Amino acid sequence: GPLGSRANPDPNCCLGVFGLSLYTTERDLREVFSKYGPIADVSIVYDQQSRRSRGFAFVYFENVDDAKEAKERANGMELDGRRIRVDFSITKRPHT
């Protein structure tokens, strides 16, 4: 149902996208998200034993301002009959 408590209030060119369909593709995500500016890539998350989608993905813009427009426009809309959610994200690297 409804949810207000989940958010990432820190802008970046990387967005995480959640609540997708098992039939959603990186083409359909490009078709939803390229409305807001240039895209570097898009990657869906898949299960490592059953090889199906896990219902979430990450979208990578060329600039933080394109990702800001996208996060204000796509967050909470409908795609393939499934009602999504969209938030800012960041990359990671090992360190010692």
Torsion of CA 58, 88, 41, 83, to 10 degrees: 50
How was this structure determined? It was done by NMR
| 47 vs 55: CA distance, rounded Å | 10
Going along the chain from its start, the domains and CATH numbers come out as: 10-96 (3.30.70.330)
| CB-CB contact of 61 with 40 (8 Å) | yes
Token duo for residue 90: 């960041």
Which of 88, 91, 96, 94 is closest to 16 using CA atoms?
Answer: 88
Q: Determine phi and psi for 72, rounding to 5 degrees.
A: -80, -20
Q: Are 8 and 88 in contact (CB under 8 A)?
A: yes
- The DSSP element (H or E) to which 30 belongs, if any, is helix 26-33
